[PDB]
Structures are given as structure tokens and as C-alpha cells.
Design an enzyme around this catalytic site. Structure first.
Site, PDB file in Angstrom:
ATOM      1  N   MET A 381    -137.957 -20.650   2.149  1.00 32.18           N
ATOM      2  CA  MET A 381    -138.421 -19.885   0.993  1.00 32.18           C
ATOM      3  C   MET A 381    -137.291 -19.079   0.363  1.00 32.18           C
ATOM      4  O   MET A 381    -136.517 -18.425   1.061  1.00 32.18           O
ATOM      5  CB  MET A 381    -139.569 -18.950   1.380  1.00 32.18           C
ATOM      6  CG  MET A 381    -140.216 -18.253   0.186  1.00 32.18           C
ATOM      7  SD  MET A 381    -140.689 -19.384  -1.165  1.00 32.18           S
ATOM      8  CE  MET A 381    -141.986 -20.302  -0.388  1.00 32.18           C
ATOM      9  N   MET A 409    -140.066 -16.794   5.117  1.00 32.71           N
ATOM     10  CA  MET A 409    -138.682 -17.247   5.203  1.00 32.71           C
ATOM     11  C   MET A 409    -138.336 -17.590   6.654  1.00 32.71           C
ATOM     12  O   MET A 409    -138.942 -17.055   7.590  1.00 32.71           O
ATOM     13  CB  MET A 409    -137.733 -16.156   4.685  1.00 32.71           C
ATOM     14  CG  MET A 409    -137.690 -14.897   5.548  1.00 32.71           C
ATOM     15  SD  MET A 409    -136.830 -13.497   4.744  1.00 32.71           S
ATOM     16  CE  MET A 409    -135.200 -13.971   5.022  1.00 32.71           C
ATOM     17  N   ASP A 434    -129.356 -17.954   2.563  1.00 39.16           N
ATOM     18  CA  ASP A 434    -128.723 -17.237   3.663  1.00 39.16           C
ATOM     19  C   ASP A 434    -129.662 -16.255   4.369  1.00 39.16           C
ATOM     20  O   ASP A 434    -129.507 -15.994   5.565  1.00 39.16           O
ATOM     21  CB  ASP A 434    -127.457 -16.496   3.196  1.00 39.16           C
ATOM     22  CG  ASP A 434    -127.519 -16.068   1.737  1.00 39.16           C
ATOM     23  OD1 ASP A 434    -128.620 -15.800   1.202  1.00 39.16           O
ATOM     24  OD2 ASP A 434    -126.442 -15.988   1.129  1.00 39.16           O
ATOM     25  N   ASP A 461    -125.631 -17.074  -1.548  1.00 42.16           N
ATOM     26  CA  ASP A 461    -125.563 -16.157  -2.683  1.00 42.16           C
ATOM     27  C   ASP A 461    -125.335 -14.731  -2.188  1.00 42.16           C
ATOM     28  O   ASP A 461    -125.109 -13.821  -2.981  1.00 42.16           O
ATOM     29  CB  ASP A 461    -126.872 -16.183  -3.467  1.00 42.16           C
ATOM     30  CG  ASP A 461    -127.978 -15.429  -2.752  1.00 42.16           C
ATOM     31  OD1 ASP A 461    -128.118 -15.632  -1.529  1.00 42.16           O
ATOM     32  OD2 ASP A 461    -128.694 -14.638  -3.403  1.00 42.16           O
ATOM     33  N   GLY A 463    -127.544 -12.720  -0.763  1.00 42.49           N
ATOM     34  CA  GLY A 463    -128.630 -11.830  -1.111  1.00 42.49           C
ATOM     35  C   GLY A 463    -129.987 -12.481  -1.000  1.00 42.49           C
ATOM     36  O   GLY A 463    -130.096 -13.663  -0.677  1.00 42.49           O
TER      37      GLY A 463
HETATM   38  C1  LIG Z   1    -136.588 -11.576   1.186  1.00 41.57           C
HETATM   39  C2  LIG Z   1    -137.476 -12.802   0.860  1.00 41.57           C
HETATM   40  C3  LIG Z   1    -137.082 -14.233   0.875  1.00 41.57           C
HETATM   41  C4  LIG Z   1    -135.744 -14.620   1.210  1.00 41.57           C
HETATM   42  C5  LIG Z   1    -134.709 -14.686   0.153  1.00 41.57           C
HETATM   43  O1  LIG Z   1    -133.368 -15.058   0.449  1.00 41.57           O
HETATM   44  P1  LIG Z   1    -132.620 -16.271   0.776  1.00 41.57           P
HETATM   45  O2  LIG Z   1    -133.401 -16.832   1.917  1.00 41.57           O
HETATM   46  O3  LIG Z   1    -131.270 -15.844   0.953  1.00 41.57           O
HETATM   47  O4  LIG Z   1    -132.851 -17.111  -0.571  1.00 41.57           O
HETATM   48  P2  LIG Z   1    -132.299 -16.993  -2.033  1.00 41.57           P
HETATM   49  O5  LIG Z   1    -133.482 -16.707  -2.895  1.00 41.57           O
HETATM   50  O6  LIG Z   1    -131.370 -15.820  -1.995  1.00 41.57           O
HETATM   51  O7  LIG Z   1    -131.724 -18.293  -2.227  1.00 41.57           O
HETATM   52  S1  LIG Z   1    -138.334 -15.344   0.454  1.00 41.57           S
HETATM   53  C6  LIG Z   1    -139.472 -14.025   0.740  1.00 41.57           C
HETATM   54  C7  LIG Z   1    -140.643 -14.242  -0.284  1.00 41.57           C
HETATM   55  C8  LIG Z   1    -140.314 -14.052  -1.764  1.00 41.57           C
HETATM   56  O8  LIG Z   1    -141.878 -13.339  -0.392  1.00 41.57           O
HETATM   57  N1  LIG Z   1    -140.312 -14.327   2.065  1.00 41.57           N
HETATM   58  C9  LIG Z   1    -140.229 -13.149   3.033  1.00 41.57           C
HETATM   59  N2  LIG Z   1    -140.438 -13.576   4.394  1.00 41.57           N
HETATM   60  C10 LIG Z   1    -140.392 -12.626   5.439  1.00 41.57           C
HETATM   61  C11 LIG Z   1    -140.608 -13.121   6.747  1.00 41.57           C
HETATM   62  N3  LIG Z   1    -140.126 -11.242   5.060  1.00 41.57           N
HETATM   63  C12 LIG Z   1    -139.908 -10.779   3.661  1.00 41.57           C
HETATM   64  C13 LIG Z   1    -139.954 -11.747   2.564  1.00 41.57           C
HETATM   65  C14 LIG Z   1    -139.749 -11.418   1.090  1.00 41.57           C
HETATM   66  N4  LIG Z   1    -138.944 -12.555   0.460  1.00 41.57           N
HETATM   67 MG   LIG Z   2    -129.815 -15.666  -0.618  1.00 40.24          MG
END
Ligand SMILES: CC1=C(CCOP(=O)(O)OP(=O)(O)O)S[C@@]2([C@H](C)O)Nc3nc(C)ncc3CN12
Ligand SMILES: [Mg+2]
Ligand SMILES: CC1=C(CCOP(=O)(O)OP(=O)(O)O)S[C@@]2([C@H](C)O)Nc3nc(C)ncc3CN12
Ligand SMILES: CC1=C(CCOP(=O)(O)OP(=O)(O)O)S[C@@]2([C@H](C)O)Nc3nc(C)ncc3CN12
Ligand SMILES: [Mg+2]
Ligand SMILES: [Mg+2]
Lengths: 545, 538, 543
Positions: A381, A409, A434, A461, A463
Site C-alpha cells: 500500500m 502497509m 520504503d 521516495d 517518505g
Molecule cells: C503511512 C501509510 C502508507 C505507507 C506509505 O509509504 P510507502 O510505503 O513508503 O509508499 P509511498 O506512498 O511513499 O510510495 S499506506 C497507509 C495507508 C494510506 O492508509 N497504510 C498504513 N498502514 C499501517 C499499518 N499504518 C499506517 C498507515 C497509513 N498509510
Molecule cells: Mg515512500
């Protein structure tokens, strides 16, 4: 019934009766007898590094084999570490049985049953040794039947360590359920005969293997347009059905939605409103037909006109037999499908895309080159998820694990490992950002240890981009979404896995091809430029929401 | 879709859409808007004197019509007073929807959803006014479908008093599944062929009205022996099927049990292990077939070799169409039924207080195929169950897994309301009578043609004899006497008191003629009970 | 420790250690071993006719003695029939311990009573191991009687009470000391600077362990006092001239006016649930919290000073730090004066109509209710009339507080109250609605020869609900039922029955019923036409 020195032995036998090939988990004092008993069994013990991932891996096994994946953990934190994984499996409809240890009955402590009830279809604690086998057996029944989901079984240490008298309960499997009533079926066959703009809306159950052949036969016979929820993303795709209208629920410009609005007859198969809010496609104007293993979870915007409850395959086969000719698309329906055709041409583009950090489109294109009908793809995600979803029509994977209503995630890598274990002779590609990567990357050790043939891709990225873009759109400023960089290549190699780091657009395809050819786990870090993400986010329903 | 001035108005419309004819309950501030809205409806408001009885009455309505009976109460004690009644309905498979008031959302507190969850199939609180209609509709769906049960809906005061936007969700009614697959039916029809000692074990669903014709059709063409759980006590009786082996679950001398143990094939229809412990009849050596509207609730002693799920009627009709010859009983099978023959014969008294058997016989004489009989819990319950085979009533409400006392009278009132032109006879002990007798006022007010019979022993005999057996002494099972004749008359009902054996039949006959509520106190001598107890599963 | 033949013997032994004098309940197969064991103890077995009433009776016992009343029921419906009663006990702070039977531990695999009772008790647990039997029971009492009292539920699996067990009885704990000296001094300093101070008494201020200390504190400070209904008996108009009445029901109480005027509010044994702080605390005054437990803070209840500890001790110490009595401010004196005027005006002339006027009944009731008698009040319109004139009832004790507004409580409360002091009379009052929900206990009353006089205000309906509907909708729904011959009804139980047929027959009938040595019931036809007037004095009408 046989005499058992240890309830644990009975438990293992019950697992074998279910056909369990492996168990995922981390041992602890309260549950180690079950781990021990598994030593004298054909069931393979797979130690993971974090229990949450045992549940994720189990979910993959469940989704693919239709038979529940199995997680085994100790009491207390052993169990609480599974909760998120169990909720994810339950929301996605993946069959998973988790057996968690517990303090002796005399010592009872953490009320795990109360904790899992909210995120499971079944949660129960064995309070009597003579109930051991049935409780475990019923856990599987609950997980696998109806709308599949997760089940938790609490096992007190004294009950598993102590002797028990009882017999193994044979695995019944799926009951012989009747198709919908014939008269009701004939009634739908009749509606189809008089329909001008019919359309099938596929939900989770439509994507089950058990309904695979039936669905294909029905689509082949009727040539009626099809749109799908993300839970049914893999049931049909652009390359196997010319009248596929895309997946609905994420983007605001899908032919599926246009066809649902234009529809005079909508037939839902294995669909539940939870998969895609009816309040966004069903006006209530068209005649609605509900087909599924359970009665319609009726709603304000979902009140079927004809309800066909029963074995889905059975119903679809009978419907197929009562359809005489293939549909002749009306001018509008044909126009909508032609629009999607042009829409896909624009999305595909041709272009060079040699910038660095890489443009999402370049990454998506390179990913489509390595994923073929023999490769499984798991998607985590984050923003990259939206990009992949936008181009799902162009991936030709044997199977794609992407649906994630809870937006959890960290799922990709574990899902990939679980999927690989079901068919170890094939390759699996997992992709995440990441942030997601670091929540489950401890399983890289597990992959190395299992020599799992998994290629994990990281869109870098530095972040939590998916969250950042929403904060921006709403507050025009960021908060808690940026973190530091890491040498992912070195990170992966420290596990003994193969690591790669893409330093130019030109190195992308060659790197991916090399990583894919590696016989074992490999990790490829891919710097990405997310500045065009606002463009993509403009195509989401969220924009209107 | 409309714009309603009060959520209460939408709730009432949804009720009308469900075909609800009356609501049982007690008003209160939090819920009075729903009571007010009902005034402008075709739905009859029936005030009861204790909420528990609103649940009992609703249960009777649901059991008969297949459409959920409705209880309406206020917040707090209004809802907690329904618990035992809702649990009883859920245990017996009676479709009941209870709408309970709740404090305004802003004010939320008693967690009623949590309290009801353990005793209902569905328990939910409306936290979104726009979900009001759907939540109510689903309450009925959940209570009426599959194996029926009770459903509870918590309605916040602000939600029913405030405006709402929504539409009345049409009543889809329990969806119609198709009969089990042809291949599955052929397989079962084949097992019945390759079977020498087959027997039908009937459970709750086998007794639903939609399955009556199909059941008779299957029994008539196969002539296979049949035994039933008490939940299915009325599915088949001695006089409508020569090979009926009696109801199993209570007595240790039933033919059904012997036949079940002898059986090489057991076909369970609409049965769930909860109705009668499999440990009591299934050794596992017999091929086990499960036929029901829902998958089997498997357990250590209930793992069906063949599992058929679907419309029971359609499944049974098709099964019957695949059977070519009636069954010829094996030596042992005929022997067992031969024994039941002798048993029936032995079962086929001027002392005072009256003897249980004298009372039972006097009751069978007034209860006919036009009369509904409801039975409470107590020693008298065991006596009546012993002779169920000779009662010939329109319907008999007796199954009571929870052994909840007080059910008889309210069950009777609810049953009478479904078919007002017929008479209802309810029987209880003195203990059970007083737990729900406040509803006699309700009966008089409704002019319910109900005759209530009280077996008087001045104690809790059913518990007393168990203590006697185990401790040879009694504790907390004896209480004072009462003038039940005067008691009933104080309500405006007709009362009678049997003072001699000869007076029995005449008194009952006289009370049966009364066009309205009537109560008959019948002094009983329980000294012979230890004997009957010896016939129970020890 | 010790070896017990039956877990039941240990339970009965544990109860004796707690001092239990009797048990209320209905036996059943799963729990009969306990009823059996009780046969050999001094503990009296009191069979009731409906379990709900066993909880109501136990609550009266607990409230008066300070020691938990005990209910004993069987599994299943035996337990679910106690819920409303346990909730009512918990809400009023009445210590009650209920012991419910359960199916054999091994059979518990197929009613989650623990989950059903948890939302309405302070303590709910199931003995899953015979070795935890005695402690679970002991802890149930500790939870019910300590801190702010409440109800406790214990599920006893049949196999556990029937099977042998090893263990010993656990003695009853009991006991903090006065709040910290610094605190009592800081508070005293606040009192010396207050121009409009007022005490708001809550449940804990009415506990007997504080009757003396409170009296002391009030006599040396002469600061105004207002009480919640849970503390309705802490102080009265007679023993304290600056009493401002009970707050929580009427919108014209001096107590509320003084609270809104205050520059210093000292709450004793008070919890917000007893009277919504949103109704009296604007936040202008300095708030002092004094209770056996920390304050249950909320939006309108954040004590500037919080003292926790032995109330009797703290109040006795604070009194020693009170320089001189308070000289009422003009506004305070004026508010108290208006309460005196209000009381005389409320006393209204000759109400001889029939059905009887509520005020005529109230006057007659005040006459038979003496300082030796306990009065129990059910829920209904009559309850509001009685509360309005609570100042003129001078009973030994009054059981009226009822936050849940649960009907049917009066008769069983009365029976429980009588059992604690059988040498006294108890007067219970209810409407016809509440009466029929618990009247089955009239048989219990006759059997016990309980000296209880139950009065029924008869209107042939649920008037308290009807008046609210009339107000909001100008029409009635579900609030009317048929009439009954209550005289004959009561006599059928073997109790004395009466039915007032005219206004002049009221007082003579009440006297005759009062003289009956045993259970008596008097039905009093009432004309509720004047209710709109009284109901207009409720906070509710302003709502
Ligand atoms: C922080 C986050 C996600 C991850 C984003 O980062 P990357 O995995 O680096 O992806 P990118 O978007 O930077 O490519 S999904 C996301 C989602 C948007 O709600 N899923 C989450 N999962 C857990 C277990 N805790 C908090 C969230 C809130 N959201
Ligand atoms: Mg990221
Ligand atoms: C006391 C009692 C019953 C009643 C017995 O008395 P009568 O109703 O007078 O019948 P009889 O047996 O004296 O004729 S059943 C019975 C049952 C044996 O368990 N049902 C109960 N129902 C509730 C609601 N609470 C407790 C019990 C325990 N048992
Ligand atoms: C119906 C009713 C009460 C009783 C009214 O009637 P009577 O007891 O006859 O009193 P009266 O007002 O007619 O004199 S209180 C009252 C209360 C107003 O909320 N308490 C209730 N208690 C239970 C157990 N269920 C429902 C209610 C709702 N309210
Ligand atoms: Mg009796
Ligand atoms: Mg009244």
C-alpha cells in the site's frame, strides 16, 4: 476415538486431516508442544521473524488454495502481534486459521478471544481437552465457508500438553449447496433476453477458483460487459475478455461505472456492498439481480429485485444454459468501451521516460515486462499502489494480490513468500514503497532461509507519500510523512539476499531482468519521482469524496 | 426516498412494509415517539405489563407466521427486562425483532448491544439516522432467515425524534434457495438404497410449515422410521405416521434412540446438535447425512458424511422422487418398533389432590386439532411430554432448552392473536404462573380466548425432586398457598378451582366454554414423580 | 487450608465469613447444591418468586447494612432474570453480590453471563477453577462493599460447587485515613475567604460512617447544604436550617440557585452521575472534591482542589479548622428564605374529590409514615409528587433514588428493608404499572409475615409516560390498560386488602392497613389531572 498423551498430537492430526502443508509462526513456552508435535508430522514448520507476517503469509496460501493458511504463535504478545494480519485477511476474505497459545486454565491474563472477535469470523478458546479437535476443525469450516475469513483458536498450555481422549474429525470441505431456484434463474434469463444494456458487476466470490470455469462459460456465452471490484480484480482482465470495463472503486473515469449508470439490468455476482459503496454506482433505476452464496447484505442503495442465493457456479452454469445468443452492444455501450480503448491508448503512450529519479510510468512499464502469466504479483500500500491499479489492465500475471481495503502497509513481501510456497516452481514479484518495506522486511531472512524465488521491488521516495499527498490536498502542508534515506542494496545483501540499486533509467530493465533471473530472493531499490502524483490523484473518487 | 420529520415515522413505515400487524411493549420517554407514530399506522399497539412477556408473545407470533413478532421497549430497564425473553426466542428459533430505546447519541450509558449479543442472532444500534430503515430491515432479515432467531435494534432518542432522509426498503423476505444439487440427491437416494436400517432424525426446520407437504411426501414414499427433537416435536406425531419412533432428548426409553443406535444410515433434516446432544445417539458407525437450510454445525459427534444445503422442501421433494420402494423393516428395526408398540399399550384415579395422569387425560380431552396448547416448565412438563403421543392439538409450543419458567401464558396470548377465532390452552405450575401472570390483565383487555391451567403443588417441584434424588432433603422449593380462583377473578377473568377429582372434567369443560380469559387451579399429588423421573436420561 | 466435600460447602462457609444473614433467590439444578449446603448453616434461605426481586431485596439489605445483600440463582434464565435488578443496584451504589449457577465447565462447549452482567456491575467473574472459588467470592464482596458500592456477579459452574475442593475461608478485609493535613488546611483557608460557600452532598456523604462527622462539620460551619437524591437522607430541613433541598429533579430548588451563586463549592461523596454537572456548575466557583475515591472528572467537573480519603476523618478534621460560623450573604439568605416560602406555599385547600387528588394522598401518607418507619418509593408520577414533598416526610429512612427509573422496585425493597429490622413497619408505594411487575412477591411477604404496607396509586395506566407524551404530542399511545380489583387481588395471596372508595375513607383505610401485623395492600384511585402543574416544575419541562 484414540487415546492421546498430548492434546498437541491431536491438534497436529486435525491439521493433517485438513491437508495443511505448512504452518507459519514463532514458538513460545505456552505453545511449544504443538511445534514439537509438528516435528513428527509431514507438515512443514516455517519460522517467521514477526508474527504479523505469519498471518499475511497464511492469507496468501488461503486465497490461492481456497484452503486456510495456518499461523501458530505463543501466548500474550505472540497473539497480539497477529491482530493486524488477521484483520487484513478477514477484510479481504482470505481463509486463515491462527492457533495461539494461552496460559494454563488454572492461571486464567490477556483475553485474546475478546481481542480477535472484532477482526475475525471465528474466535474461540478451548476450555476442555475433549473439545480440542472440534474447535480446531470448526475453525477451518468458519474460515473457508461462506464469505471466507480468518479464525482464531486459543489453546491453553495445559490442554495442549495434557493427555486427551478423542478422535480426529474428518475435513468435510464445501457442502453440496443447491443453485438458485430454477424459476428464479429462468426469470433472470428472461430479463437478460429483454435487456438492452446489461452488465455483470463482479465481487469477491466471483474470483474464487470454484467459480472460475462457470464464470468463463457465462461470459463466453453471453458476451455481456463485465466490471469488477478490487476484491475480484483477478477474475477477469482486459486481455481475456474484450468487453471488460475495468475495476471500479478507485478511479472516477472507469467505463465500468459509465456502464452501470447506463445499465437497464445489473447482475452482481459474489458481490457485497462493502467491496464498493453502492451509493456511487447504483441509482436504483436499473433492475438489479443479486447472485451469491449468501443473501444480499441489503442496504439503502442495494435492494435487489431478484435474489439468486446458492452455489454461484451452479447458478451461473444454469444461467448460461438459458442464454441463446450473445449480446449486441447498444450504441452507447459500444461507445463507452471504445472510450476505454482510447483511454488505455493515452495511458500507455511510445515515450522514452529516461528521467531519474524514475517516472512512475517507466517503472510500471518495466514491471509489466517481467510479469507474465507464470509470475505472481503482490502489491503493498502506497502511491505506487495507485499507479499499478491504474494500469492493472496491462499486467498479465498468473495472479495479482493487490486488494487491500484496510490499506495495510507491509503486506507485499509476506504475501509473496506465502504465494511462492504454494507453487515453489514459479517466480513471485512483490512491490512496495520504503515505508511498507520496513514494516515487514525482517522476513527477508525467512525468504533467504527458504530460498524463496521472490523479487521484491522498492519504490524509493524517503517518505509516506500516499499520506503526504492527501495532507497537501487538504492542508497544503506536510506533517510526519518524511524520513531519512537508506542503502537498500546493502540492506538486502546483509541478509544474504541479492541486492540491486537502480541509478539511472537505463539500468532499470537490465537490473530487473537480472534480479528476476536470480534463483532465490532479490531486492531492487528504485528511486522514484512522485511529483506527477497529483495528476493521478485527480482521477480518484477521493477527489469527489 | 422521502424527507421524514421524525426517524420514528420511517421506522413505522418499515414495519408496515414488513407486514407487522401488532407491536408488544411498554412505552418510555426515550422511545415514545415510535409509540406515537404507530397511532397513525395500521399496526396495533399492544401494551404488556412486563417487557419479558413482550418477547415471549412476539416469539409465538414469529413461530407461527414465519414473520418476526415485534417488541418495543424504552431504554435502560426497558431493554434489560427483555433479555431472558430474547434468549428464549433465540434458543427455540423463533423470529423476533425487538426495538429498544436508548439515550441520545450525545449523552452516550448501558451497553445494550453488548448485553444482547450473547442471546440474539443480530444486535445493533443506529448511530446514523440515514441507516435507520436499513438497520430495521436487516433486523427482520437476520431474524427470519436461515434458522430463525431474535434480533435487537437500539434506537437513540435523538435519532427517532429528529428528521431523516431515506426510503422504505421493500421487504424482500427470506430469499428462496434452490433444492440441493441433483448429484447430491442421487447420492443420498442411493445411500437409502444401500441401507438396511435407515432413520430420519428431525430437527427444528423440518417442522416449518413450508416443509410439511414435502416431509409427508418423503415419509409416505420411503416409509423410513422417524424420530424428532422436541424443537421438532410437532413435525410428525404418532397418529400421522405408523413408523414414528417418538421424540428424543428427554426419556431414556424411546424407540427413536434405539433405532438411531441400530441405524447404518441417519438422515438429519433441519437439525442442529444443540437440539439433542449427538453424544447421546451417534456412535459414528452409521453413515450420516445432513439436510438443512444452513451448513452443519459440526462437533466431536456430528460430522456428516454427506452434507446437503438448500431449500428443504425442494430437497425433500426431489429425494422422494428418487425413491422407488417403501422400506421393509429389518428384524431388529421391527423389534424396536415392536417394543414401542408394547410401550404405547402400557401407556394407553379418584384421589385428591389429583394424580398427574388424571390431569393429563382430562387435558387431552379438551385439547383438539382446533386448539393450540402451550406448555410451561415444571414437573407437569415432563408428564405432558411423556404422553405427547396422545395429544392431538392444532399446535403445541413446548420446546424449552433453557427451561425458562413463565413462558406458557404469554406464548398463548401471542398465539391467540395470530388466529383469534380459535381457542388456546396454556398450562403451567404455580411457580411459573406467577412469573408471568401479570399478563392476565393484558388477556382480559384483549379478550384473548385463552384457558390457563395451573397445576398446584405449592412449590417448585421440578427442582424439589432433583434435590430429593441427590440430597434426600429439600431447600428453597416450598412456598405458601394461594386462592387462584379469586386471583384470576380480580383481573376480570373467569376463575375455577378443582376441589375434587369428579369436578375436574366438568370444571375444564365449563372453563373451555368461556369466551375469553379463564384460569383453573388444579391441586396435584406429585408423590409418584420419582417414578416418572426414573424414565429420564440419568 | 482444608478439604471440602463440595465446593458449595466452601461457598456457604465463605458467606458466613462475610456475615451474610440470608440469601434471596430461586433454586435450579445447576445451583441446588448451594441451596442444600445452606440448610446446614445459620444463613436463612428466602425463596422469592422472580429473580429480579432477589436483586431488589438484596439491594435494600446492602444499602441499610453497608454489607452486600445476597442473591442466589440457577444458570441460564435464572441469571438473565437478575440483570435489571443488578443494574439498578449498581446505579444507586447498593452493595449486592449475586451468585449464579452455570453449566459444568466441560459442558460449556456447545450463555456468556459474565459478558451480560459486565455492563451493569462493578465486578463480574466466573470461577473456572475450584481453587479460586473462595477468593472469587471474597473478592466479589470486597468489590461490592468498598470504594463506591455496587453490584457484583459470580458465575459458579455446577461441577465446581458439587465437586470436592481444597482451600480455606478468606477473612473479610474491611478498610484509608483522613485526607492530608495540608489539604484540609488549604480547604479551610478557602472557606475563610468564601462569601457564598455551599456543600453538595453525594451518595458517600449519606453513609452511616459519616453521620456524626458531617453533623459536626455542618454545626461548626453553618455553610448551606444541598444533596443529590442518592444522598437524600444525609441531611434534612429539621436538623439543619440552611438545608437547600435535593437537586436533580425540580427547576426551582434553592440548592441549584446557591450552586450557581457560589464562589466555593465543596462536593462530598459526590460523583457527576448523581446529578449532571452541566446543570449546576458554570465553572465560576472554586471547586473542592472530597470522596473515598478520586474525582470522576468531566467537562463540567474539574476540581481545583481534590481530597481523597476517609470522609468521616477529613470532615472531622476540617471542622477543627473552621474559625467561625458563616454569615449568609444577602442573596444566599434570600434564596433560603424563598425555599421556606416555597414550602409553605406548596403545602397549599380542601381536596375531597374522588378519585383522590395527589396532594390529599401525600398528606395522608405523611401522617402514617413516622420516624420509626422506612418508606420505599417506586417509579411513576406519584414518585414526583413524593419527591416534591420529601421535606415533609419524616421517616426512619427513605428509599426513592432511582437513576434508571426502574419500575417495580418498591415492594421488594420494602421486603428487604423489613428483614434487616423485622421489629419495624415498612411502607412501600407504587403505581399499578410498577405494582404488577413485582407483586408476585406478595406471596413471599405473606410467607415471611413481613410487616409491609404497600400502597397503590391507581390510574389504570402508565401515567408518568403518558404525561410526557401529552406534552410532546397532545395524544397518548401504549399508556392505558384495564382496571383490577386490587383488594381481592391481595387477599388471594393471604394478605390484607383494601380499596379506597371515597376521599373520606382514605385516612381510616390507611390506619386500618397500618394496624395489620403482616402484609397489607391498599389501592388508592388517583386523579392525575393536576400533573401538568407539577411536571412544569421539573428540569425536564424546561428541556
Ligand atoms: C503511512 C501509510 C502508507 C505507507 C506509505 O509509504 P510507502 O510505503 O513508503 O509508499 P509511498 O506512498 O511513499 O510510495 S499506506 C497507509 C495507508 C494510506 O492508509 N497504510 C498504513 N498502514 C499501517 C499499518 N499504518 C499506517 C498507515 C497509513 N498509510
Ligand atoms: Mg515512500
Ligand atoms: C424453579 C424452576 C421451575 C419452576 C417450578 O415450579 P412450578 O412452575 O410451580 O412447577 P412444578 O414443577 O412445581 O409443577 S422450572 C425451572 C427449571 C428446572 O430449570 N426453570 C427456571 N426458570 C427461571 C426463569 N428461573 C429458575 C428456574 C429453575 N426451575
Ligand atoms: C412505564 C413506566 C413507568 C411506570 C408507570 O406506571 P405506574 O407504575 O402505573 O405509575 P403512574 O405514573 O401511572 O402512577 S416508570 C418508567 C419510567 C418513566 O422511565 N420506568 C420503566 N421501568 C421498566 C422496568 N420499563 C419501562 C419503563 C418506562 N416508564
Ligand atoms: Mg409448583
Ligand atoms: Mg399507573
Amino acid at each position: 476415538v484414540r487415546q492421546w498423551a498430548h492434546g498437541a498430537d491431536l491438534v497436529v492430526s486435525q491439521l493433517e486431516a485438513q491437508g495443511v502443508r505448512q504452518v507459519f509462526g514463532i514458538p513460545g513456552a505456552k505453545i511449544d508442544k504443538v511445534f514439537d508435535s509438528l516435528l513428527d508430522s509431514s507438515i512443514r514448520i516455517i519460522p517467521v521473524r514477526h508474527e504479523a507476517n505469519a498471518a499475511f503469509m497464511a492469507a496468501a496460501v488461503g486465497r490461492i488454495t481456497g484452503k486456510a493458511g495456518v499461523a501458530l504463535v505463543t501466548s500474550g504478545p505472540g497473539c497480539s502481534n497477529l491482530i493486524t494480519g488477521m484483520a487484513t485477511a478477514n477484510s479481504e476474505g482470505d481463509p486463515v486459521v491462527a492457533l495461539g497459545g494461552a496460559v494454563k486454565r488454572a492461571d486464567k491474563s490477556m483475553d485474546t478471544v475478546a481481542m480477535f472477535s472484532p477482526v475475525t469470523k471465528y474466535a474461540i478458546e478451548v476450555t476442555a481437552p475433549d473439545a480440542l479437535a472440534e474447535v480446531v476443525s470448526n475453525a477451518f469450516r468458519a474460515a473457508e465457508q461462506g464469505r471466507p475469513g480468518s479464525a482464531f483458536v486459543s489453546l491453553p498450555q495445559d490442554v495442549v500438553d495434557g493427555p486427551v481422549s478423542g478422535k480426529v474429525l474428518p475435513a468435510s470441505g464445501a457442502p453440496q449447496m443447491g443453485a438458485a431456484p430454477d424459476d428464479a434463474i429462468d426469470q433472470v434469463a428472461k430479463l437478460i433476453a429483454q435487456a438492452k444494456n446489461p452488465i455483470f458487476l463482479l465481487g469477491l466470490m466471483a474470483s474464487q477458483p470454484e467459480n472460475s470455469k462457470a464464470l468463463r462459460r457465462l461470459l463466453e456465452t453471453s458476451h455481456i460487459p463485465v466490471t469488477s471490484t478490487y476484491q475480484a480484480a483477478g477474475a477477469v482482465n482486459q486481455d481475456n475478455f474484450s468487453r471488460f470495463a475495468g475495476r471500479v472503486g478507485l478511479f472516477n473515469n472507469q467505463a465500468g461505472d459509465r456502464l452501470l449508470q447506463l445499465a437497464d439490468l445489473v447482475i452482481c455476482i459474489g458481490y457485497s456492498p462493502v467491496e464498493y459503496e453502492p451509493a456511487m454506482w447504483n441509482s436504483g433505476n436499473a433492475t438489479l439481480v443479486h447472485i451469491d452464496v449468501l443473501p444480499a447484505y441489503e442496504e439503502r442503495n442495494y435492494t435487489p429485485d431478484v435474489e439468486l442465493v446458492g452455489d454461484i457456479a451452479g447458478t451461473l452454469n444454469k444461467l448460461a444454459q438459458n442464454i441463446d445468443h450473445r449480446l449486441v452492444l447498444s450504441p452507447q455501450a459500444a461507445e463507452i468501451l471504445r472510450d476505454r480503448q482510447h483511454q488505455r491508448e493515452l495511458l500507455d503512450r511510445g515515450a522514452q521516460l529516461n528521467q531519474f529519479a524514475l517516472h512512475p510510468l517507466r517503472i510500471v512499464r518495466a514491471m509489466q515486462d517481467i510479469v507474465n502469466s507464470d509470475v505472481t504479483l503482490t502489491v503493498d500500500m502506497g502511491s505506487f499502489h495507485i499507479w499499478i491499479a491504474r494500469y492493472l489492465y496491462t499486467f498479465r500475471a498468473r495472479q495479482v494480490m493487490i486488494s487491500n481495503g484496510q490499506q495495510t502497509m507491509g503486506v507485499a513481501l509476506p504475501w509473496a513468500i506465502g504465494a511462492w510456497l504454494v507453487n515453489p516452481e514459479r517466480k513471485v514479484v512483490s512491490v512496495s514503497g520504503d515505508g511498507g518495506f520496513l514494516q515487514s522486511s525482517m522476513e527477508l531472512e525467512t525468504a533467504v532461509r527458504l530460498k524463496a524465488n521472490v523479487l521484491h521491488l522498492i519504490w524509493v521516495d524517503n517518505g509516506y507519500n500516499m499520506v503526504a499527498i492527501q495532507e497537501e490536498k487538504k492542508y497544503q502542508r506536510l506533517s510526519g510523512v518524511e524520513f531519512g534515506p537508506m542503502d537498500f542494496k546493502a540492506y538486502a545483501e546483509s541478509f544474504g539476499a541479492k541486492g540491486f540499486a537502480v541509478e539511472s533509467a537505463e539500468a532499470l530493465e537490465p537490473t530487473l531482468r537480472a534480479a528476476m533471473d536470480v534463483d532465490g530472493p532479490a531486492v531492487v531499490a528504485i528511486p522514484v519521482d512522485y511529483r506527477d502524483n497529483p495528476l493521478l490523484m485527480g482521477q480518484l473518487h477521493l477527489s469527489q469524496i
